[PDB]
Amino acid sequence: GGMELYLDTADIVAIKRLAKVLPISGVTTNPSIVAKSGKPIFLLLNELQEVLGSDKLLFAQVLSSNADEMIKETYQLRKAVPSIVTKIPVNAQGLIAIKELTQQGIPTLGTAVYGAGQGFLAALAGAKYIAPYVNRIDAQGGNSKDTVLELQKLLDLHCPQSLVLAASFRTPRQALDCILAGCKSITLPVDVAELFISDPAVDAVITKFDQDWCNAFGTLSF
Amino acid sequence: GMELYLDTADIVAIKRLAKVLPISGVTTNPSIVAKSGKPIFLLLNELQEVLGSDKLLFAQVLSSNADEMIKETYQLRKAVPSIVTKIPVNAQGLIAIKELTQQGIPTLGTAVYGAGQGFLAALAGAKYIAPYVNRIDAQGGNSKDTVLELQKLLDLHCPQSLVLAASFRTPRQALDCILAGCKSITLPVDVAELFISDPAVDAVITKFDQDWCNAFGTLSF
Amino acid sequence: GGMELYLDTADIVAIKRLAKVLPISGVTTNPSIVAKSGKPIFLLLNELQEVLGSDKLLFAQVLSSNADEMIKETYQLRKAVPSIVTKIPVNAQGLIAIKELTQQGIPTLGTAVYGAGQGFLAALAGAKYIAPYVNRIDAQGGNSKDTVLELQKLLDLHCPQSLVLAASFRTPRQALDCILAGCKSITLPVDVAELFISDPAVDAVITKFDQDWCNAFGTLSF
Amino acid sequence: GMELYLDTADIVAIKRLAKVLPISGVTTNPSIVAKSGKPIFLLLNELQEVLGSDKLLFAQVLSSNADEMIKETYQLRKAVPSIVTKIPVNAQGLIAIKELTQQGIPTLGTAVYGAGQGFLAALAGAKYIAPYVNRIDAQGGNSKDTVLELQKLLDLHCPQSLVLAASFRTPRQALDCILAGCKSITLPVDVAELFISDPAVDAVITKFDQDWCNAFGTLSF
Amino acid sequence: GMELYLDTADIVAIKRLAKVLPISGVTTNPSIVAKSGKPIFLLLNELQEVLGSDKLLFAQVLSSNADEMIKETYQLRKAVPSIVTKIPVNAQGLIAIKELTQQGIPTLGTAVYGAGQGFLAALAGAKYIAPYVNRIDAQGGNSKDTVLELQKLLDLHCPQSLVLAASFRTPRQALDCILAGCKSITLPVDVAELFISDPAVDAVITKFDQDWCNAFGTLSF
Amino acid sequence: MELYLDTADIVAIKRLAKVLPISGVTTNPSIVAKSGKPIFLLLNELQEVLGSDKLLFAQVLSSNADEMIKETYQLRKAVPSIVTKIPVNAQGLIAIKELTQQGIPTLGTAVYGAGQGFLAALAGAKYIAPYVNRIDAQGGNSKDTVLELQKLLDLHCPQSLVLAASFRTPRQALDCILAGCKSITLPVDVAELFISDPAVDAVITKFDQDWCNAFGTLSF
Amino acid sequence: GMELYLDTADIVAIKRLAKVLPISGVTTNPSIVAKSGKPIFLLLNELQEVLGSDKLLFAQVLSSNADEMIKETYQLRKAVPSIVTKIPVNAQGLIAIKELTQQGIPTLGTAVYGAGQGFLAALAGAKYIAPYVNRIDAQGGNSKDTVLELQKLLDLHCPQSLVLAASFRTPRQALDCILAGCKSITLPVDVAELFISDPAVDAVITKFDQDWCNAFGTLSF
Amino acid sequence: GMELYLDTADIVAIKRLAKVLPISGVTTNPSIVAKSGKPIFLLLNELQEVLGSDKLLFAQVLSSNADEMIKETYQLRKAVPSIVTKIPVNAQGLIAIKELTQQGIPTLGTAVYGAGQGFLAALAGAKYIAPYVNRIDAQGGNSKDTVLELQKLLDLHCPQSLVLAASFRTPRQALDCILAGCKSITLPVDVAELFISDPAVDAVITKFDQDWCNAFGTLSF
Amino acid sequence: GMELYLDTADIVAIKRLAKVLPISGVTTNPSIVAKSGKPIFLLLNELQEVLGSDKLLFAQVLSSNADEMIKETYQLRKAVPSIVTKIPVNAQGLIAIKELTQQGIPTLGTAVYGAGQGFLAALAGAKYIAPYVNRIDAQGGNSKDTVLELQKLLDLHCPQSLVLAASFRTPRQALDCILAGCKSITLPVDVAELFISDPAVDAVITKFDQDWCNAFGTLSF
């Protein structure tokens, strides 16, 4: 029980289109995604809320490398979007920020996770969501499938209050393996999300259905 | 809660197999209805007559546009108020499934060739997800692996949906599906018959009858 | 929990001997077993009840190949032995009979099962017991251990009100693999039943125990 | 090495697929020939000529008696001197195979449903052993396991014999056979065509063609 | 609820090991008693004296006849009212076990060499089942496989019984038994001592002391 | 591969030798007992039915190595190429060593464990016969024991081979040759089960039906 | 739940890492105290001031006699009432653990090189069992195997105890322990820091920041 | 091929077992000789006399210094010129092994508790490597795993060396060593006799004789 | 064959360890050289002196530019004609490796963190590929898996190259590398010592001596 599917993008046009088609729970962003959109972050977040509605969840990342400024940036994000989940890279200063924000009851996501132990520490520090960079692990000679299975196992064994938000994908096989490992949430870029619903075998069997129907009845109606 | 369906529009076969097998109803698709040559609303009433009222029917929308798929769903429901509507899992199909779920209308996401595809239909609200088992094997895939993955996703993440395994040329394909844990399956006539006609069974029954007749003369108590 | 161990014989002498030794729940018969005893089936059912007592369970098989007469034969058997379980071969006519008897609350066993799918259909039809012919599967180039594992798995997944009654054995290894697969009942021929309790290693160690005891104390007594 | 055969008596389909696929010959059985409706010697004449002399033919005896099986083998060898005679692996079949082996006549042991049965035919002298893959699956067995065991027995104990995998409803069945190590296989027409008609292949060729025409105007260098 | 017993009649070693290990009592068998040289009623008296009152004793009948095994059981119970009586799992032993179970008298089915044999004793009502682990290994068997099968049968079918693993020459055998899930075990002296006397432990404790004494002068706070 | 029949039934042997590609016939004292024939009368009967081109096995009776040797001589005198079966225990090992030195082939029989059977191979026995069904009958796992024994011979005894014996099911026999055993001896009931699958008769019946429906004769 | 400890006496390192990591306290052993040069009662006071009242401390007895180990346990409890005392799992160690458990004192059984040895300490009543993971690897063993076996024993038989995995040279060892199910672990400083100092993390964070600044010219919202 | 040795100094047992088992010689160690009460050169003379010349003997050096180990090796070669000298694989033993290999004197690296330790002795020139199988099990290890690792290293990197498996309490340990591929093994008396004393063998022989006697009267031809 | 190297600039340790271990040479890297404080040509002459003439040395280039890497390779060969030059496997190192290969100069591709990266160096001509085993574990990877993959790629595709496994904190890492099939390895001092200093070995040597002295009085023959 419980899957949360997110779109990993800041293209408002694609979000509007894919949110109609896919059963999505919200949108994740990161500094490069926001920069490639060219929109100031507070304007983007307003456009995101308008297109998504009020029942959905937004994620946005801090910029500073010291924990005190990360905490101040979280406050800015919360002021713009009161339910927003703040993404914090899992390093020394991030762990300091995650611990304090947890003490104040502010939800966080531990991001830029390349190893199972690294992400586990962010869960122990209080982050509800842990985001391994699946494709970057594969891009650096690792095995993202193994890393995600280990991370999910550690949360199942030891941190039931946290979950994996698998992120960073170039293929549907990567995404599929993450949710097969048990990840309770995932965020997909536009190109990978579209691939799940554009298999050519599906078109060909529908074409064959319509042809058989027309050859027997003339029109494609009941 | 296993549900066994027959995947056919052959009323003669359905009448016969419904007396033999513990079936919950009948599934159709546009090729099956086309092969019967009957208008679908006549066929649907014929199916209700042979099956009765405790059983469940499945029928497929025709158009590729979500608005007309929904209109076609309403036509089917009007003819058969309990029918489950089959909708291909593609962009327009997912839109239809979400709309119909919003209204409490049960659906089946069909023409599923991959586990992620089928999983998206369940998340959009379809109660049933039907992988095309044999078509996956026919196009160089491994249907056993695909069905295992899809059932695993439903067990992990969508306990309110089930796999309705479909499209079969061998009983081995169908058996592997229910061994994977699929809670529903629809068999074509030829595969259904194969499960219940093993020459080894006839042979041992013949030996039983010979032994009984050798000892007592008549095949009776 | 509840294991049910049956004896698969009509040999009254061997039944009273092995029922004193083994924890048996009753006796299964089939037409060849009854034919070999030479006794009319109602005479035999009388002697079986007398030798076994009132707490045990009996299984007897229909003769007819037509569903209507299988049903009537079931009623004949139930008239003689009100608690008897009727064995019905899992073929087309057999499934018709099982379906009707299930609606009427009459317990049945689906017998002559050579494949997991076949047996599963009898459980879906309502048969409480499913009896694969374990040794006959091995005798016809198959693999009885694989088949019994698939059958038990189907019942655990989908039919928790049915159980496997494993039958037809030439070796204790076959029977042991069945209860290891999780089969909740089993019926043993006399020779296989005796083998489970006549290992020469046990006799040798007891003999060594007695020799050590008499070497030390002179008598085999406390 | 690998010997690929077609399992059919349809002379039109054989001519079409022998142009397309790298086939080594054609196998027949009594039902296959019966379905064509052609007398056996008429059919063998047509098969020899459509295939040419480079290829191999397989045809099955009819009788249940070993001495008549042998005489029927002589009839086939007279018509097609290089033919391989198919003999069902049962008691009389095994007698024929031993006698024909002694006479230096090649045989195939057919109707194999178990690995031990097929192994006995190889020990008797049959060069080819044909498990009925799909019939094993159709009767509650597991053809993948049975073929693996048969192939392992020949690899361990009978290097002069090989499996000719036969009887197919899905390409997955046929692929599992050659992955098991089977050195020869015979496909019915519909399975052979499935191997070469995947719609994803069509889709990527169509896409290549659109990309080329946009860039260069015509589908030419 | 693990129960650890010692398998010995050496009363000096019992009181020593009972101060080190958390033992629940002592198991005997006719050879252990015979080698002790002490009559059993004297031995049983010394065991109660050394162990105290909250511990459990196991002793074995001598006769091969079920009626006399039952008489011997009553003799043991009169000397030690809480004692568990060990009965070999054979035809006469099973008769004895069933009768004593009906009378509410606890038993251990001993001299178990196979999983089926042990399982029958649990069905007959024995609370404890004692495979002879090392004797299985000694006669060309595999005790690890046999114990895993026995524990599996009890987990599946007899929740009220437990394995009391017995007969050991190596700690590896004992460790594999409790890893298999056996809820009780009885160890001979030499195997029990090996669990708690690793040279690596002494070596690391020595190095701890040397470091502490180099820092602070003596081995004290 | 060497396939033998494990029986003394002369009628059954003559029938199955025509059908199966057998190399000969193995006996043991119970098999000879059940026949009721004195062993030399039976062996001459076996050599007449089998012909001069097959191979016989027969077992010593004595428990003492010296008398096992003399019993082997009696066997060789009756059947010069016979392979003598010697139970693998301490006295049996002594006899096998000695017979090997005389150039007399032996089978080490009554093998219940891989180590035991391996020792008879190192002592010179060409054939090693595990009692497959007896291992299963006494709480063992014959498939495990036979895999271990065959592995030992593959690693260390190229001149020796397993002769798998004692069977109640074709499944047992198949698992032995799948394990690599190069010889096997089958009782009559198991041997016939390999060639009497009802599925095979059923498909030939359908073949004949399709052919007769198309052509009107069951002929070419 | 999970308990993460630091295995060190370096006060400067403890206060730095306690701010970063979600630690539950600090474990010490004789060598660790000896390197620090501080008398243990001074170091225990510093450790409380740096950590605060909510954390948990662990410290090891010195003696080899159960009596003196028990004395040293009371000295430690006098200074730190909530402290958990570490006792080597050997003969005299198990005597101390059995006595301290009967008094309701919590203990940790340390210097564990095998699963059986550690299991006996849990049966004696030690709440924590500390295998020396790296020392098992250092002496030709396989620490991953030993930790798996030890944790399986506690899961099967001692639900009131838990493994406190200790002694590490690589983060791979530490990760394997928590993947095995260990509910607690204590890390040396250098392994702890490696978990949070991957060059790939710095590289991707740098790319994010450079992308942002190239577009908007400041690192601010 | 396989080399089977006896690990004893019992001249009575050696003489008895050499007539039954195919043994290649006898190994000793300092404890086996000490337990004999015989001075080593007297014992070595007796072992040659009992075994004859076509056998191989193993004896172990005493000192911890490499120079004295070499001296002790010369004394053994003077006493028994074909003998194989056992050297414990530690720092000094490795120096001794490298020196004796340069001189053409064959050695066995003994007291091997880990695969890496044993491998270095092979690389240093020792023809035989002796893991202490039962001692690895006694100290919380897994002898099966260590021997498999040691054999693998020699197969991959040092095939001119071989494992001489030693130290046994059960035939199962011994059998696993030879199943792992060890080309030599040395057995204590009691384990060696267990391989040829299975009670199942005596029982089936008795049944054979009972069948024979019932049918013929005398247990003869 | 197996090449064992020491990964150090510690002349004293090398002299000591080369006496004990079968050492084929010494590997260095810029940190090891810098830590010794000796300019590289000084250290190389000192290594040649302690190792002698038939041992192999490895040394690493400094520059990030392929042209300058090649010139530095020429300087190293001038100093030590047989030296193997270490080159980091990045874009410029690959350029250097391809050019040095064309000149017949031997190279090692170092700083390998992924199997594909190392494989590219082998294809470019590097004879040795040096994965940084412990650094892979240090950064949240699995060194065991990465080494297995790298070795497999060389076994499948590059028969002229081998893995020189490097960078170790535990003997477990080192043993897993040679078990994976790596044909060369370089050990730091502390790990090399651990292979030959097991406390179990000392303890069994001590028992052998006590047994000998109890029965004979002196520790001599």
The 10 Å CB-count burial string (b at 16+, else e) for G105-137 is: bbbbbbbbbbbbbbbbbbbbbbbbbbbbbbbbb
Kindly name the residue from H86, H127, H144, H183 that is annotated as catalytic: H86
Which residues of G are catalytically annotated? 86
* Closest alpha carbon within chain E to H137: E172
Measured between beta carbons, which residues in chain A are less than 8 angstroms from residue D199?
200-201, 203-204
The C-alpha angle with vertex G134 and arms to G130 and G138, in degrees rounded to 5, equals 130
Token representation of residue G118: 């550690």
Instruction: Name the burial class of residue B78, with classes exposed (0-12), middle (13-18) and buried (19+) by CB atoms within 10 angstroms of its CB.
Output: exposed
Q: How many contacts, defined by CB atoms under 8 Å, are there between B and D?
A: 40
The type of residue at D165 is: A
Chains with 3 or more CB pairs under 8 A to chain E: C, F, G, H, I
Q: How far apart are CA E132 and CA E169, in angstroms?
A: 11
Minimal C-alpha gap between H51 and chain E (Å): 28
Nearby residues of G5 by Cβ (< 8 Å), 6 or more positions away: G23, G24, G25, G26, G27, G56, G58, G164, G184, G185, G186, G187
Token representation of residue I154: 């060389």
- Its sign, for the CA torsion E31, E32, E35, E39, is negative
Q: How far apart are CA A8 and CA A3, in angstroms?
A: 16
Token representation of residue E8: 């010995």
For residue C5, give the H/E element and its range. strand C4-8
| Total residues found in chain F within this entry | 220
For residue B25, give the H/E element and its range. strand B25-27
Chain F contact present for C16, CB below 8 A: no
DSSP C133: B
Longest dimension (CA), chain G: 72
In 3D space, the residue among I203, H78, A163 whose CA is nearest the CA of residue E197 turns out to be: I203
Contact F141 E145 (CB under 8 A): yes
Q: Is the CB of residue A66 less than 8 Å from the CB of residue A76? A: no
Q: Token pair 């014929």 is at which residue?
A: B46
Experimental determination technique: X-ray
Name the resolution in angstroms. 2.0
Contact H142 G145 (CB under 8 A): yes
3-class state of residue D178 by DSSP: helix
Q: How far apart are CA C99 and CA I16, in angstroms?
A: 86
CA distances in angstroms from C215 to B75, C208, C212, E20, E31, listed in the order given:
94, 10, 5, 34, 10
Which residues of F are catalytically annotated? 85
Contact H138 E171 (CB under 8 A): yes
Nearby residues of B195 by Cβ (< 8 Å), 6 or more positions away: B171, B174, B187, C115, C117, C118, C121, D140
**Residue G131 β-bridge partners:** G112
Token representation of residue I91: 């874009």
Q: Is the CB of residue F190 less than 8 Å from the CB of residue F211? A: no
Q: Is the CB of residue I133 less than 8 Å from the CB of residue I167? A: yes
Q: Is the CB of residue C166 less than 8 Å from the CB of residue C175? A: yes
DSSP A54: S
- Its sign, for the CA torsion E19, E23, E26, E32, is negative
The type of residue at B167 is: S
Token representation of residue D203: 């889709």
Q: How many contacts, defined by CB atoms under 8 Å, are there between F and H?
A: 96
Q: How far apart are CA E198 and CA E190, in angstroms?
A: 13
DSSP C130: E
Residue I72 phi, psi (nearest 5): -65, -40
DSSP sequence for C179-196:
HHTT-SEEEE-HHHHHHT
DSSP H214: H
Contact D200 B172 (CB under 8 A): no
3-class state of residue B107 by DSSP: strand
Task: Count the Cβ atoms, other than its own, within 10 Å of residue E115.
Answer: 26
Contact E145 F144 (CB under 8 A): yes
Chains with 3 or more CB pairs under 8 A to chain C: B, D, E, F, H
Q: Is the CB of residue F14 less than 8 Å from the CB of residue F25? A: no
Q: Is the CB of residue F177 less than 8 Å from the CB of residue D157? A: yes
Q: How far apart are CA H169 and CA H176, in angstroms?
A: 13
DSSP sequence for C48-100:
HHHHH-TT-EEEEE---SSHHHHHHHHHHHHHHSTTPEEEEESSHHHHHHHHH
Contact D202 A200 (CB under 8 A): yes
Nearby residues of B213 by Cβ (< 8 Å), 6 or more positions away: B219
Q: Is the CB of residue C188 less than 8 Å from the CB of residue C21? A: no
Radius of gyration of chain C (CA): 20
The 10 Å CB-count burial string (b at 16+, else e) for B134-146 is: bbbbbbebebbeb
Our answer on whether H and D touch (3+ beta-carbon pairs < 8 Å) is: no
Q: How far apart are CA A96 and CA I181, in angstroms?
A: 44
Q: How would you classify the pairing of strands D128-131 and D162-165? A: parallel
Contact C222 E72 (CB under 8 A): yes
Q: How far apart are CA A11 and CA H28, in angstroms?
A: 81
Looking at the partner chain, which of H137, H195, H199 has a beta carbon nearest the beta carbon of E171? H137
3-class state of residue B148 by DSSP: helix
Contact B194 D139 (CB under 8 A): yes
Q: How far apart are CA H114 and CA H129, in angstroms?
A: 11
Q: Is the CB of residue F163 less than 8 Å from the CB of residue F185? A: yes
Q: How would you classify the pairing of strands G3-7 and F183-186? A: unpaired
Q: How would you classify the pairing of strands C163-166 and C129-132? A: parallel
The C-alpha angle with vertex I202 and arms to I197 and I205, in degrees rounded to 5, equals 140
* Closest alpha carbon within chain I to A145: I141
Q: How far apart are CA E86 and CA E58, in angstroms?
A: 7
Nearby residues of I104 by Cβ (< 8 Å), 6 or more positions away: none
Measured between beta carbons, which residues in chain D are less than 8 angstroms from residue F211?
30-31, 33-34, 62
| Total residues found in chain G within this entry | 221
Q: How far apart are CA D219 and CA D210, in angstroms?
A: 9
Measured between beta carbons, which residues in chain B are less than 8 angstroms from residue F202?
199
- Its sign, for the CA torsion E139, E145, E151, E155, is negative
Measured between beta carbons, which residues in chain C are less than 8 angstroms from residue H202?
200, 204
The C-alpha angle with vertex B33 and arms to B32 and B34, in degrees rounded to 5, equals 90
For residue H112, give the H/E element and its range. strand H107-112
In 3D space, the residue among F171, F178, F179 whose CA is nearest the CA of residue F146 turns out to be: F179
Looking at the partner chain, which of B178, B207, B215 has a beta carbon nearest the beta carbon of C38? B215
Q: How far apart are CA I156 and CA H16, in angstroms?
A: 52
* Nearest-10 crossing angle of helices G91-102, E11-20: 60
| Total residues found in chain E within this entry | 221
DSSP sequence for B165-182:
EB--SSHHHHHHHHHHT-
DSSP sequence for chain E:
--EEEEE---HHHHHHHHHHS---EEE--HHHHHHHTS-HHHHHHHHHHHH-SS-EEEEE---SSHHHHHHHHHHHHHHSTTPEEEEESSHHHHHHHHHHHHTT--EEEEEE-SHHHHHHHHHHT-SEEEEBHHHHHHTT--HHHHHHHHHHHHHHH-TT-EEEEB--SSHHHHHHHHHTT-SEEEE-HHHHHHHT--HHHHHHHHHHHHHHHHHHSSS--
DSSP H90: S
Measured between beta carbons, which residues in chain H are less than 8 angstroms from residue E141?
172
Q: Token pair 């259904």 is at which residue?
A: B192
DSSP C47: H
Q: How far apart are CA C28 and CA C8, in angstroms?
A: 5
Our answer on whether G and D touch (3+ beta-carbon pairs < 8 Å) is: no
The type of residue at D146 is: T
Looking at the partner chain, which of E41, E113, E149 has a beta carbon nearest the beta carbon of C202? E113
Nearby residues of C4 by Cβ (< 8 Å), 6 or more positions away: C25, C26, C57, C165, C184, C185, C186
Minimal C-alpha gap between I109 and chain A (Å): 16
Task: Count the Cβ atoms, other than its own, within 10 Å of residue B206.
Answer: 12
Measured between beta carbons, which residues in chain C are less than 8 angstroms from residue D141?
115, 142
Chains with 3 or more CB pairs under 8 A to chain A: B, D, G, I
Chain A contact present for D197, CB below 8 A: no
**In G21-142, which ranges are continuous DSSP H helix?**
30-36, 40-51, 66-79, 91-102, 115-124, 133-138
Kindly name the residue from E86, E144, E152, E183 that is annotated as catalytic: E86
The type of residue at F154 is: D
Q: Is the CB of residue F111 less than 8 Å from the CB of residue F149? A: yes
Minimal C-alpha gap between B196 and chain F (Å): 14
Looking at the partner chain, which of F36, F62, F119 has a beta carbon nearest the beta carbon of H196? F119
DSSP sequence for F95-159:
HHHHHHHTT--EEEEEE-SHHHHHHHHHTT-SEEEEBHHHHHHTT--HHHHHHHHHHHHHHH-TT
D 108-137: CB under 8 A from B: 134, 137
DSSP D83: P
Kindly name the residue from A20, A39, A56, A87 that is annotated as catalytic: A87
Q: How far apart are CA A203 and CA A209, in angstroms?
A: 10
Measured between beta carbons, which residues in chain E are less than 8 angstroms from residue I197?
none
Which residues of D are catalytically annotated? 86
Minimal C-alpha gap between I127 and chain A (Å): 21
3-state secondary structure chain I: CCEEEEECCCHHHHHHHHHHCCCCEEECCHHHHHHHCCCHHHHHHHHHHHHCCCCEEEEECCCCCHHHHHHHHHHHHHHCCCCEEEEECCHHHHHHHHHHHHCCCCEEEEEECCHHHHHHHHHHCCCEEEEEHHHHHHCCCCHHHHHHHHHHHHHHHCCCCEEEEECCCCHHHHHHHHHCCCCEEEECHHHHHHCCCCHHHHHHHHHHHHHHHHHHCCCCC
Contact B138 D199 (CB under 8 A): no
Contact E20 G91 (CB under 8 A): yes
Contact D29 F207 (CB under 8 A): yes
Measured between beta carbons, which residues in chain D are less than 8 angstroms from residue F180?
156
Instruction: Name the burial class of residue G160, with classes exposed (0-12), middle (13-18) and buried (19+) by CB atoms within 10 angstroms of its CB.
Output: exposed
Q: How far apart are CA E94 and CA C20, in angstroms?
A: 9
| Total residues found in chain D within this entry | 221
Kindly name the residue from I86, I98, I127, I152 that is annotated as catalytic: I86
Task: Count the Cβ atoms, other than its own, within 10 Å of residue B53.
Answer: 6
Contact I139 G170 (CB under 8 A): no
Task: Count the Cβ atoms, other than its own, within 10 Å of residue I34.
Answer: 11
Measured between beta carbons, which residues in chain B are less than 8 angstroms from residue C96?
19-20
- Its sign, for the CA torsion B61, B63, B66, B71, is negative
Which residues of C are catalytically annotated? 87
Instruction: Name the burial class of residue E8, with classes exposed (0-12), middle (13-18) and buried (19+) by CB atoms within 10 angstroms of its CB.
Output: buried
Contact A92 G196 (CB under 8 A): yes
